[PDB]
Write a protein that binds this ligand. Structure first.
Ligand SMILES: NC(=O)c1ccc[n+]([C@@H]2O[C@H](COP(=O)([O-])OP(=O)(O)OC[C@H]3O[C@@H](n4cnc5c(N)ncnc54)[C@H](OP(=O)(O)O)[C@@H]3O)[C@@H](O)[C@H]2O)c1
Ligand SMILES: NC(=O)c1ccc[n+]([C@@H]2O[C@H](COP(=O)([O-])OP(=O)(O)OC[C@H]3O[C@@H](n4cnc5c(N)ncnc54)[C@H](OP(=O)(O)O)[C@@H]3O)[C@@H](O)[C@H]2O)c1
Ligand SMILES: [Mg+2]
Ligand SMILES: [Mg+2]
Lengths: 326, 326
């Protein structure tokens, strides 16, 4: 079984609010789905607190026996940003299924049919899913560990956020390429040059790390012609090879490997570079950057310039307690 | 034949200067190659003016019969930024061949053997090469056409820079993905979502646009196994297919097609997206962005947020008069 007696809900802040604080149809809907959620809860003898960005403090989180994101994977990532305890269930409801993807949120039937999931909880007609998350240690010189809420010679210190999707590292200016020395599973330092790095979990293996590494159905077409050029096949086969490739880009969130990737490295005779991607347990990056940041779930940011040393790994006491319905 | 009687030289600004205004070995070398260039010129009866960033004005450029970049492709891009006349020869000398790539600069023998090229000019033992460049028209609402030198309801107006490598468009914050409606060779508008766009010339087909689109020798390995899985071959064959692919990413600078590309678009059931890349004559982009810029050769920048409409094409009167030695 499972039913909590205290719940905080953290609702995204629709563009119609973003301004006030076809964009009305947007807001009326998100409202008409927060409403259906809170009223389904209160119909089950459940004290609920409803909050937005700055209200949603960890004090709220401690109070509640579970946490609901009423929004999208952002709002998931948001709520899942302020949760360190691997026992606290974090739950998201896709509040806008024509706009919000909601890959971290429940099946979309449960949006307007919410008491149904709730029943499935009291009865346990579900599963528990502990998604691994990435934690980050910052050492080096001149470092600056104060996080930055993007949504408006020292030692190793634990930064106050766990990365559920990925950690992004690169120059702030999107056009100034990035320089840093990197070490994987405690290997020798290799000076890469790229437009950044991306160290996802299996949760975020579908996220940003997918759209980097994935290939074109065309780039597949090309390479295959070129192969019999340098038993043929057709349109249908192109996709029954292309996806089997791109499948090998995703892994199970429970798997505790980090999938790091070089984001557009730089070839040539003065910038000899390593691999594109591979899995690991632990990475370590020495910023040789002038004005870069460390960017977690596209939501929190740390100053990561020269002499700073960030080192990412997975720890079990970070796995995120989430659920799972048929 | 060809020999100019007036020359401006525009030298990069080495890190040892960047600070003052192993980094000394760096500076002593760049100096010992600007020296060898100016003295080779003055040994040919050639008035020379030597300049850095802010000195290098268009007034300098008008005065000189030709323009020399003493640096790298940056310094090339720099000098080639302030030249609109397709008759003014722009010439670059790789001033630091262990660090500067210099794909826009002369062969590297000509760095310490500079009077030799000069002879090759008086004698015409060379070729003229007019690299096509990209020009940019900004229309729409609330637009802001003042350029920004990254190196520290209105009509269409010509922005004051020609793009030699590429024009980059995307959100300034490297993690906030980008939204805009785009039109190619005057086609229907298609709403993409990505980490940016990249519209290069054949000059910059090797540049940024290469490291996006190019594939792994591994991603090739994978896809090929997967093919006979879903006449085999080995390590050697992997590279005699991989490059023949990646070759099809570069085109001749004289060719006046624009190679645009979607930089990490976003898949799924709410973000249906177009193609990765293809050539065109003319693109048009309607910014649906909150805080994006237009970034030219990684050197000049324009504000490109919502309602602004940028539209890129190639015009012959922009081809960049450069040379070519054996
Ligand atoms: N060009 C790219 O591929 C790109 C660029 C920046 C960020 N991102 C990703 O998006 C995250 C930032 O949070 P955000 O969602 O508020 O930005 P976003 O703009 O909403 O991200 C783009 C789309 O990816 C989906 N998504 C987010 N997290 C996912 C996950 N773990 N698995 C599968 N899909 C996911 C989102 O669905 P929702 O609509 O429900 O949010 C979103 O519609 C970051 O983890 C980053 O990984 C991707
Ligand atoms: N991750 C990437 O692929 C990336 C990221 C940002 C910018 N860039 C490119 O670099 C340009 C910015 O100027 P920058 O050179 O001062 O930055 P940069 O840091 O020097 O660019 C990275 C390297 O690319 C080489 N390069 C530059 N232009 C090229 C061209 N037209 N063809 C082939 N190679 C070229 C440069 O050689 P030099 O050392 O002689 O400059 C440089 O070492 C922009 O056009 C942009 O295209 C690439
Ligand atoms: Mg979102
Ligand atoms: Mg450079």
């Amino acid at each position: 079984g499972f039913r909590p007696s205290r719940v905080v809900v953290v609702a995204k802040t629709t563009r119609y609010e973003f301004e006030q604080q076809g964009l009305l149809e947007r807001h009326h809907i998100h409202t008409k789905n927060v409403e259906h959620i809170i009223d389904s809860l209160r119909n089950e003898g459940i004290e609920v607190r409803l909050v937005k960005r700055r209200e949603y403090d960890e004090e709220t989180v401690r109070w509640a026996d579970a946490v609901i994101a009423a929004g999208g994977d952002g709002t998931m990532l948001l709520a899942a940003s302020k949760v360190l305890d691997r026992l606290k269930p974090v739950i998201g409801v896709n509040t806008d299924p024509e706009r919000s993807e909601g890959h971290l949120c429940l099946p979309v039937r449960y949006t307007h049919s919410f008491p149904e999931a709730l029943q499935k909880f009291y009865r346990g007609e579900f599963r528990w899913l502990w998604r691994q998350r990435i934690r980050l240690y910052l050492e080096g010189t001149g470092i600056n560990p104060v996080p930055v809420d993007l949504h408006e010679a020292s030692g190793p210190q634990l930064l106050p956020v766990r990365a559920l999707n990925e950690v992004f590292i690169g120059e702030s200016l999107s056009s100034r390429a990035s320089y840093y020395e990197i070490s994987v599973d405690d290997g020798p330092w290799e000076k890469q040059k790229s437009s950044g790095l991306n160290l996802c979990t299996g949760t975020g293996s579908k996220a940003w790390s997918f759209n980097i590494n994935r290939v074109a159905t065309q780039a597949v077409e090309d390479v295959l012609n070129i192969a019999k050029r340098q038993l043929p096949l057709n349109r249908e086969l192109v996709e029954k090879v292309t996806n089997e490739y791109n499948e090998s880009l995703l892994y199970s969130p429970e798997e505790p490997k980090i999938l790091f990737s070089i984001r557009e490295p730089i070839a040539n005779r003065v910038f000899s570079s390593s691999r594109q991607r591979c899995f690991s347990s632990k990475v370590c990056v020495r910023s040789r950057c002038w004005d870069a940041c460390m960017v977690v779930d596209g939501g929190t940011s740390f100053e990561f310039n020269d002499g700073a040393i960030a080192s990412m790994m997975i720890n079990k006491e970070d796995e995120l307690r989430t659920v799972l319905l048929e």
